[PDB]
Amino acid sequence: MKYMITSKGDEKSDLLRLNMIAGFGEYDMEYDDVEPEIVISIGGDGTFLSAFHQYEERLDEIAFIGIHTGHLGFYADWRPAEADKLVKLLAKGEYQKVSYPLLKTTVKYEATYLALNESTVKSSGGPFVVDVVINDIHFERFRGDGLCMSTPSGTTAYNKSLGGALMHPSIEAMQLTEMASINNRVYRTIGSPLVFPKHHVVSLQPVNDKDFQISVDHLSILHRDVQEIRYEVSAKKIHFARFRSFPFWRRVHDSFIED
Amino acid sequence: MKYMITSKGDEKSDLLRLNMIAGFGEYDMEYDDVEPEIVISIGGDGTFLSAFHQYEERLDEIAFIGIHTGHLGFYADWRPAEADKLVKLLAKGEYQKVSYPLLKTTVKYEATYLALNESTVKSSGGPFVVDVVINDIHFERFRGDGLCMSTPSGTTAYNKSLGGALMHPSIEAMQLTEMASINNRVYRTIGSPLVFPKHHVVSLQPVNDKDFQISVDHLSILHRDVQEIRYEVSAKKIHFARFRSFPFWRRVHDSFIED
Amino acid sequence: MKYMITSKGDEKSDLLRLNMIAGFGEYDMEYDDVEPEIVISIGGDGTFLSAFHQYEERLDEIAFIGIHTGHLGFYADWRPAEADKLVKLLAKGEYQKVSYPLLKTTVKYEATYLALNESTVKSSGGPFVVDVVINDIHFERFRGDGLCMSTPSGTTAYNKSLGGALMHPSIEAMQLTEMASINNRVYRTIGSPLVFPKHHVVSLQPVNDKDFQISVDHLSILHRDVQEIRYEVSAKKIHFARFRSFPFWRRVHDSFIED
Amino acid sequence: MKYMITSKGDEKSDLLRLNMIAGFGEYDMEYDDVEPEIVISIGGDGTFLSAFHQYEERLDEIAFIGIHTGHLGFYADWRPAEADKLVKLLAKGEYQKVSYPLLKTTVKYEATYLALNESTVKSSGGPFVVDVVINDIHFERFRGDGLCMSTPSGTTAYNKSLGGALMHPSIEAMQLTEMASINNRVYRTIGSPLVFPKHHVVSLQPVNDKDFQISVDHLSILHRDVQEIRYEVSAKKIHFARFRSFPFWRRVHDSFIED
Ligand SMILES: Nc1ncnc2c1ncn2[C@@H]1O[C@H](COCC#Cc2nc3c(N)ncnc3n2[C@@H]2O[C@H](CO)[C@@H](O)[C@H]2OP(=O)(O)O)[C@@H](O)[C@H]1O
Ligand SMILES: Nc1ncnc2c1ncn2[C@@H]1O[C@H](COCC#Cc2nc3c(N)ncnc3n2[C@@H]2O[C@H](CO)[C@@H](O)[C@H]2OP(=O)(O)O)[C@@H](O)[C@H]1O
Ligand SMILES: Nc1ncnc2c1ncn2[C@@H]1O[C@H](COCC#Cc2nc3c(N)ncnc3n2[C@@H]2O[C@H](CO)[C@@H](O)[C@H]2OP(=O)(O)O)[C@@H](O)[C@H]1O
Ligand SMILES: Nc1ncnc2c1ncn2[C@@H]1O[C@H](COCC#Cc2nc3c(N)ncnc3n2[C@@H]2O[C@H](CO)[C@@H](O)[C@H]2OP(=O)(O)O)[C@@H](O)[C@H]1O
């Protein structure tokens, strides 16, 4: 099978990468970073997010694996000590796969993006006012610092810091959280996080300024003359190679409660 | 068809009830409060919750309808002015039905209950400490005022006041929120609301005191010698007669944003 | 000087108490639990709160000291290893004193209480609705689980779990936090914690039910036919014997950040 | 007396300004925008904030007055209908004055600023990590979107949207709130708002990046090679001309509860 390995670039991750390549050399496995069917990320969740976006046009043909050489990650959830066992079981194939939902972001001026964690919209220069439209009905006029739309696996990241709920990634949904909303006699927002099912479309529309900072995972670019930002659960999914059982709620416990 | 009408009991709801019965008398419709196939609640969401529990053993054979004679409700979402149109379309049948998920609560000392809004566990006398177990793995030791497990349609009720997310009721899930959790060098909880899919089981287990106040919707009873409280999405669903399109997110907007 | 020592009652605290009494026996110090001028609490913050209330009628004549035989406390902030040094410096006198503000609670049916942490008002049986009146002007009609009025040193306790601010105890103020307030088309509360200076009077007044559960620190009693609950910063203060410098913000850091 | 009037610049505020100048022309009152002793702001709270900063070097010699030609403001709290009565009572003098505390911000690379609402520190490009030091002791390493330090009268503004407490402006304090803090196995922050008395110094210190966006009220500038940001309650105060009794808590009620 064709495989590739990305590295955070520090000494630990690079040497683990070279060792796994050597281990793969003892099997019917070909290193190919153009059309791999297995993508191994060695580093942290940030390294994994970059590997996902490096290959987001071949998502249906790739099984992803994350190894954490630092603290436990939610995508980088296997320890370096297990790398030799990962080489053997990856080479045999026949492992199971698990799929997590993704967020589709459409920016009309169109450009479309996939997020594994979230997409956010923030004020560029000055106040941030957007009309929030849900399935073509005007829901609220938001004024504040910004808005965050999270995938299920993204709920443990930015979403969590904004008061959002943690959602098991088997649920096909997206979650919208507020950043420092104003509420007074003029403006009124819902306050609570909002959780949307598949096929629901949330549209952000400018009121005055048409320039915002729009993020998709780690990528953050200033977008000019934007007329609309549309969010919906993607029809595409990210696929993980299933090594063993590491339940989502145990990863939550190990990351935030104790380990 | 067999039908029954429950009333909040004030002048407005009682006379609307008598008028609808008279209107139903002009059709092939029989008043039966033992085995109705249509249950109409006239009052508020509290009146509707009582109608649901009056007939929770025949849920699969009943279509519920709520009329609000006060402010707009989330279950009582039709106005008294539409009552004559409701009589005509209910008598013809062939209306569509919509189903919302329910929460199954099991109390072991077993007793099982269904909630349309939520079930909560609170301290009876003294401090509240419970071990939270998710799918048989210990997740956290909670110390504080209590815990709330909400259905999707319950998310706009107690859940909302506790910081929970609002979830569209097409999502088959339950949501767990904390009430005033202690977090210091001794105890540690997740803080965030937790959203669980079907077939996930959340178990609350006593640490010292075995007496708690357990609520299911409006019913709140003191339960002695409790050994466990188990939550999971019910296999049963409540069925609403679908009169017209009143989207969930519009009901959210009308109730909390403006109307 | 007259002194007394209270104990949590476990083996550790009792034997530390007996050892300190023996150490005090080597000085001009008399054990008196009727009119002590020095009150030493050995246990935790709960033990200290009970010592404060045991002697709250002689607050102006007592310097309090707390020793924690378990985890660090905010009132019980000296370690057992320092007990022999505490005996020597307490016997000499001439130590400095520090004073923390207290909360005066008046319950009219009058009865008055002093709180070192907080006083709370909760629903007894059924819904909790109270009118909140600030300096005789109606501020809000609160509906929800209850309200909490905290001293500065209480802000790290119940107040913290309810989202309240942590206030340095040199500030003469009280802080009001909400417990699970309802906000919809009917009811409207401020949401935010409220911080009041001296001489401001916050009055809670019943709307329907006149029975509530009222707490003052660890004491919680059901109060019948209550017509009003009045909160204001007390003119009385608790006095601590100042052993050395242990800044409030360092106690916050050691308790909640790391130690 | 020397007076000046600033205007939001819309038709309503400009014509009200010209009418008040005409009214002042009937008294011993001289228009001077260089050394006024009375500064009248006509517009909203934003207009008032700009008037404060236009004259922040003569604060001890100026009494400020705010008139709101739109919705009620917290500084612009008098209605246009009262303008003719304001002219008469301002011309006589002998009115009372009320003083609100201010926040002193020191930026070391030094530059010092006064805030009437708040000062905030946010990430410029990339992640935001700062060490928080309280009275020279390291309190926490904050990672997240930013931090906000509010005056008492600022607590109803940005501070409120970030979960901060509302503080009566007679309290000489400042309040620190977090913006989307990360909390996991790596980082740990207090979470709660922090309220500091006079003479307490809160210092923000860079960890990696030394470039941040620093705001003081409406002014927001990018500051390069910053080594420290120091916050403390200013020794200076803003003085308002006291027209009549409009209590702070009533302004809170009228702005956020109902009016
Ligand atoms: N104010 C804010 N509060 C919270 N989060 C904020 C935030 N601003 C931005 N963000 C998040 O940063 C992401 C971009 O940085 C790469 C990443 C990531 C990531 N993914 C997850 C996830 N799914 N669950 C849990 N932790 C996750 N991290 C970890 O977040 C940290 C980096 O932020 C590191 O500890 C990562 O772990 P590691 O790389 O060290 O292993 C964005 O996508 C956004 O979510
Ligand atoms: N501290 C607390 N904060 C918030 N909620 C609290 C709460 N303690 C208890 N509860 C909720 O009470 C329920 C029991 O009272 C009957 C009901 C109901 C109900 N259902 C919903 C729903 N799905 N969405 C939105 N509003 C709903 N209400 C409305 O809540 C109010 C009554 O509480 C009335 O306005 C009801 O509207 P009406 O009857 O006047 O039409 C419990 O089940 C629990 O949820
Ligand atoms: N849902 C709730 N969330 C949070 N707090 C809640 C709460 N319900 C009630 N409460 C608080 O209990 C108090 C009554 O119990 C005695 C006490 C105390 C106390 N004082 C302080 C303080 N000033 N700062 C910080 N920790 C403090 N504790 C510690 O709280 C714990 C006991 O609750 C123990 O760890 C105590 O430490 P220790 O005894 O083990 O040393 C009430 O007064 C109320 O505040
Ligand atoms: N995410 C955010 N969430 C909340 N607030 C945020 C914020 N980002 C920035 N800010 C605040 O803006 C200020 C700069 O804009 C000028 C101002 C002001 C102001 N002062 C107060 C005050 N003391 N109490 C209550 N409302 C106040 N406003 C009103 O806020 C609105 C403008 O933001 C207008 O309604 C103002 O009213 P008006 O001008 O229409 O009369 C900053 O200083 C900061 O506080």
> In degrees rounded to 5, what are phi and psi of residue D257?
-100, -55
Q: Is C160 helix (H, G, I), strand (E, B) or coil?
A: helix
From the CA atom positions of chain D, what is the Rg in Å?
A: 20
Relative to beta strand A63-68, strand A38-43 is: parallel
Catalytic entry in A14, A28, A33, A45 = A45
Q: Considering only alpha carbons, which residue of chain B is nearest residue A166?
A: B194
Annotated binding-site residues of C read 45-46, 117-118, 143, 145, 153, 156-161, 218
Distance between CA atoms of B155 and B149, rounded to whole angstroms?
A: 9
From the CA of B56, how far away is ligand 2's center (Å)?
A: 19
- Mark yes or no for CB contact B179/C72 under 8 Å: no
**Among the listed residues A184, A137, B73, B117, the one whose alpha carbon sits nearest the alpha carbon of residue C184:** B73
| Token representation of residue B242 | 């679908």
Given the residues C10, C14, C28, C45, select the one marked as catalytic: C45
Cα separation values, A42 from A157, B230, D127, Å: 19, 39, 21
Residue D52 forms beta bridges with which residues? none
Q: Which residue has the tokens 């409280």?
A: B229
**Contact criterion met (CB < 8 Å) for B253 and A192:** no
Cα(A113)–Cα(A104) distance, rounded to whole angstroms? Answer: 6
User: C6: closest CA among C54, C52, C40?
Assistant: C40
- The alpha-carbon radius of gyration of chain C (Å, integer) is 20
Looking at residue C255, the DSSP 8-state letter turns out to be I
The residue whose C-alpha atom lies closest to atom 32 belonging to ligand 4 is D46
Q: How would you classify the pairing of strands D30-31 and D2-7? A: parallel
Residue A237: CB atoms within 10 Å = 17
Phi and psi of B125, rounded to 5°? -125, 115
CA distance D106 to C92: 44
Contact A211, A224 (CB under 8 A): yes
CB contacts of B183 in chain C (<8 Å) are 161, 256
Pocket of ligand 1 (CB under 6 A): A 44-46, 49, 73-74, 76, 117-118, 153-154, 156-158, 161, 217-218; D 144-145, 180, 182
Angle at D62 between CA D56 and CA D68, to 5 degrees: 85
Kindly report the protein residue whose alpha carbon is nearest to atom 40 of ligand 3.
C44
Domain ranges of chain D: 1-101+236-259, 102-235
The beta-carbon neighbor of B144 closest among C71, C144, C161 is C161
List of residues 6+ apart from A57 with CB closer than 8 A? none
Measured CA to CA, the distance from residue C48 to residue C6 in angstroms comes to 8
- The answer to whether the beta carbons of residues B2 and B33 sit under 8 Å apart is no
Give Cβ neighbours of residue B62 (< 8 Å, ≥ 6 apart).
B36, B37, B38, B39, B55, B239
What span, in angstroms and rounded, lies between the C-alpha atoms of B228 and B219? 19
Please tell me whether residue C250 adopts helix, strand or coil conformation. Answer: helix
SS3 of chain D = CEEEEEECCCHHHHHHHHHHHHHHCCCCCEECCCCCCEEEEEECHHHHHHHHHHCCCCHHHCEEEEEECCCCCCCCCECHHHHHHHHHHHHHCCCEEEEEEEEEEEEECCEEEEECCEEEEEECCCCEEEEEEECCEEEEEEEECEEEEECCHHHHCHHHHCCCCEECCCCCEEEEEEECCCCCCCCECCCCCEEEECCCCEEEEECCCCCEEEEECCEEEEECCCCEEEEEEEEEEEEEEECCCCCHHHHHHHHHHCC
Q: How far apart (Å, rounded) are the C-alpha atoms in residues D157 and D117?
A: 7
- Among residues A96, A25, A17, which one has the least CA distance to residue A51? A17
Residues C50, C48: Cα–Cα separation, whole Å: 5
- B165 → closest Cβ in A170, A175, A250: A175
The total of other beta-carbon atoms located within 10 Å of residue C133's CB is 17
End-to-end Cα, chain A, rounded Å: 35
Q: Are B117 and B151 in contact (CB under 8 A)?
A: yes
* A 229-248 residues with CB < 8 A to B: 247
- Do the beta carbons of residue D119 and residue D215 sit within 8 Å? yes
Separation of alpha carbons A252 and D174, rounded Å:
35
What six digits make up the tokens of A179?
């950043």
**C197/D166 CB distance under 8 A:** no
Provide CB contacts within 8 A for B81, sequence distance 6+. none
Find out whether C204 and C147 touch, Cβ atoms under 8 Å: yes
Question: What is the length of chain C?
Answer: 259
Reduce the DSSP state of residue C47 to 3 states and report it: helix
Give Rg (Cα) of chain A: 20
Q: Which of B168, B192, B256 sits opposite A200 (nearest CB)?
A: B168
Query: Which amino acid does the sequence have at B209?
Result: D
Instruction: Tell me the CA end-to-end span of chain D in Å, nearest whole number.
Output: 35
Query: Is the backbone of residue C51 left (phi > 0), alpha (psi -120 to 50) or beta?
Result: alpha
Q: Which two tokens stand for residue A24?
A: 């793969």
Q: A157 CA to middle of ligand 1, Å?
A: 5
Alpha-carbon gap, residue B81 to D89, rounded angstroms: 56
Q: Is C211 a catalytic residue?
A: no
φ, ψ (nearest 5 deg) of residue C179: -115, 105
Q: How many C-beta atoms lie closer than 10 Å to residue B245's C-beta?
A: 6
* The residue type at A133: V
Q: Are strands B96-108 and B228-242 parallel, antiparallel or unpaired?
A: antiparallel
Q: Report d(CA B78, CA B66) in Å as an integer.
A: 6
What value does the CA radius of gyration of chain B take, rounded to a whole number of Å? 20
Q: Greatest CA span in chain D, whole angstroms?
A: 70
Q: Which two tokens stand for residue B9?
A: 């009991």
Q: What are phi and psi of C93, to 5 degrees?
A: 75, -160
Phi, psi dihedral angles at D25 (to 5 degrees): -60, -15
d(CA C162, CA C175): 11
* Closest ligand by atom to B219 CA: 2
Q: Which class for D235: exposed (0-12), middle (13-18), buried (19 or more C-beta within 10 A)?
A: exposed
Sheet holding D194-197, edge to edge: C166-167, D194-197, D173-179, D146-150, D118-123, D212-216, D219-223
Pocket test for ligand 4, best of A182, A186, A189 (most atoms within 8 A of CB): A182
**Residue ranges at the known binding site of A for NAD(+):** 45-46, 117-118, 143, 145, 153, 156-161, 218
HEC sequence for chain A: CEEEEEECCCHHHHHHHHHHHHHHCCCCCEECCCCCCEEEEEECHHHHHHHHHHCCCCHHHCEEEEEECCCCCCCCCECHHHHHHHHHHHHHCCCEEEEEEEEEEEEECCEEEEECCEEEEEECCCCEEEEEEECCEEEEEEEECEEEEECCHHHHCHHHHCCCCEECCCCCEEEEEEECCCCCCCCECCCCCEEEECCCCEEEEECCCCCEEEEECCEEEEECCCCEEEEEEEEEEEEEEECCCCCHHHHHHHHHHCC
Count of beta carbons in the 10 Å neighbourhood of residue B25: 11
Smallest Cβ–Cβ distance between B185 and the set C179, C184, C259 belongs to C259
> Which ligand is closest to the CA of D217, given by its number?
4
Read out DSSP for chain B? -EEEEEE-SSHHHHHHHHHHHHHHTTSS-EE-SSS-SEEEEEE-HHHHHHHHHHTTTSGGG-EEEEEESSS--SSS-B-GGGHHHHHHHHHH---EEEEEEEEEEEEE--EEEEESSEEEEEESSS-EEEEEEETTEEEEEEEESEEEEE-TGGGGTHHHHTTPPEE-TTS-EEEEEEES---SSS-B---S-EEEETT--EEEEESS---EEEEETTEEEEE-S--EEEEEEEEEEEEEEE-S---HHHHHIIIII--
Give the 3-state secondary structure percentages of chain C, helix then strand then coil, rounded to 5.
20, 40, 35
Cross-chain residue pair A259–D185, CB shorter than 8 Å: yes
Which H or E run includes C242? strand C228-242
C174 close to C149: Cβ distance less than 8 angstroms:
yes
CB contact under 8 A, B179 and C182: no
Q: Are strands D146-150 and B219-223 parallel, antiparallel or unpaired?
A: unpaired
Question: Which candidate, B179, B226, B174, B167, places its Cα nearest to that of B196?
Answer: B174
Ligand 3 pocket member C161 (CB < 6 A):
yes
C-alpha distances out from residue C200 to B129, C132, C142, D47, D174, Å:
36, 13, 19, 31, 20
Unique residue bearing structure tokens 């901060």: D164
Quote the Cα angle for B246-B248-B254, to 5°.
75
Closest CA to D180 of A175, A147, B183: A147
SS3 call for C34: coil
Q: CA–CA separation, A167 vs A149, rounded Å?
A: 13
A240 close to A64: Cβ distance less than 8 angstroms? yes
Contact by Cβ (8 Å): B82, B115: no
Neighbours of B10 (CB within 10 A): 12
Answer for the pair D119, D150: CB distance below 8 angstroms, yes or no.
no
D77: tokens are 């709290």
- The resolution of the experimental structure, rounded to one decimal in Å, is 1.8
Q: For ligand 4, say whether the CB of D66 is within 6 Å of any of its atoms.
A: no
Phi, psi of A18 (to 5 degrees): -65, -35
Buried b (16+ CB within 10 A) or exposed e, D29-51: beeeeeebbbbbbbbbbbbbbbb
Residue tagged 């919680």 (tokens): C220
C-alpha distances out from residue C105 to B153, C112, C124, Å: 40, 6, 19
Q: In what order do the strands lie in the sheet with B173-179?
A: A166-167, B194-197, B173-179, B146-150, B118-123, B212-216, B219-223
For A105, residues 6+ apart whose C-beta sits below 8 A from its C-beta are A112, A113, A114, A115, A119, A149, A214, A216, A229, A230, A231
Tokens of A157: 């990241």
Q: What backbone torsions phi and psi does residue C141 show, to the nearest 5 degrees? A: -105, 110
Whether the CB-CB separation of A51 and A41 falls below 8 Å is answered with yes
Contacts of B197 in chain A (CB under 8 A): 168, 170-171
| CB proximity list for D133: less than 8 A, separation 6 or greater | D139, D202, D203, D204, D205
**Tokens 């949501």 -> residue:** B175
Nearest residue, CB atoms, C190 vs list D140, D188, D256: D256
Is ligand 4 within 6 A of the CB of residue D244?
Answer: no
Q: Which amino acid is at B171?
A: I
What whole-number distance in Å separates Cα of residue B179 and Cα of residue B159? 10
Q: How far is CA B226 from each of CA A166, B111, B125, C174, rounded to the nearest angstrom?
A: 28, 11, 14, 39
| CA–CA separation, C70 and C67 (whole Å) | 9
Q: Which residue's structure tokens are 């220069």?
A: A125
Annotated binding site of A: 45-46, 117-118, 143, 145, 153, 156-161, 218
C-alpha span between B15 and B48 (Å, rounded): 17
Smallest Cα distance from B144 to chain C, Å: 8
- Token look-up 């077939």 returns B199
Give A108's Cβ-side CA count (13 Å radius): 9
* Distances C147 to C159, C163, C168, C176 between C-alpha atoms, Å: 10, 12, 21, 7
To the nearest 10 degrees (0 to 180), the angle between helices D83-92 and D11-24 is 40
Neighbours of B203 (CB within 10 A): 20
For residue A43, the CA-to-ligand 1 centroid distance in Å is 13
Q: Distance (Å, rounded) from C-alpha A170 to C-alpha D5?
A: 62
**Strand C128-134 with C137-144, pairing:** antiparallel
Residues in chain B closer than 8 A to C71 (CB atoms): 184-186
The Cα A171–Cα B196 span in angstroms is 8
**Which is nearest to C178 in space by CA: B152, A193, B179, B185?**
B179
Please report residues of D whose CB lies closer than 8 A to that of A259. Answer: 185
Q: Answer yes or no: are the C-beta atoms of B223 and B211 closer than 8 Å.
A: yes
Q: How far is the CA of A166 from the centre of ligand 3 (A)?
A: 28
Pairing between β-strand A228-242 and β-strand A219-223 as defined by DSSP bridges: unpaired
What is d(CA D115, CA D113) in angstroms, rounded to the nearest whole number? 7
CA of A70 from ligand 1 middle (Å) equals 14
Backbone angles phi, psi at A51, to 5 degrees: -70, -40
**DSSP assignment string, B152-185:** TGGGGTHHHHTTPPEE-TTS-EEEEEEES---SS
Q: Is the CB of C73 under 6 A from ligand 3?
A: yes
3-state secondary structure of C217: coil
Architecture of the CATH domain A102-235: Sandwich (2.60)
D164 interaction partners in chain C (CB closer than 8 Å)? 165, 192-193
Q: Do A195 and B250 touch (CB under 8 A)?
A: no
Q: In the structure encoding, which two tokens stand for residue B147, read together?
A: 């815990």
Largest Cα separation within chain A, whole Å, is 70
Nearest residue to D158 (alpha-carbon basis) of D199, D117, D105: D117
CA distances from D22 to B172, D19, D27, D35 (A): 68, 5, 10, 20
Exposure string over C54-86, b if 16+ CB within 10 A, otherwise e: ebbeebeebbbbbbbbbebbbbbbbebeebeeb
For residue C78, give the DSSP letter.
Answer: B
List CB contacts (< 8 A) between C73 and chain B. Answer: none
Question: How many angstroms separate the CA atoms of D33 and D5, rounded?
Answer: 8
Q: Is B77 in the pocket of ligand 2 (CB under 6 A)?
A: no
Q: Which of A23, A20, A28 is nearest to A1 (CA)?
A: A28
Is A158 in Cβ contact with D184 (below 8 Å)?
Answer: no
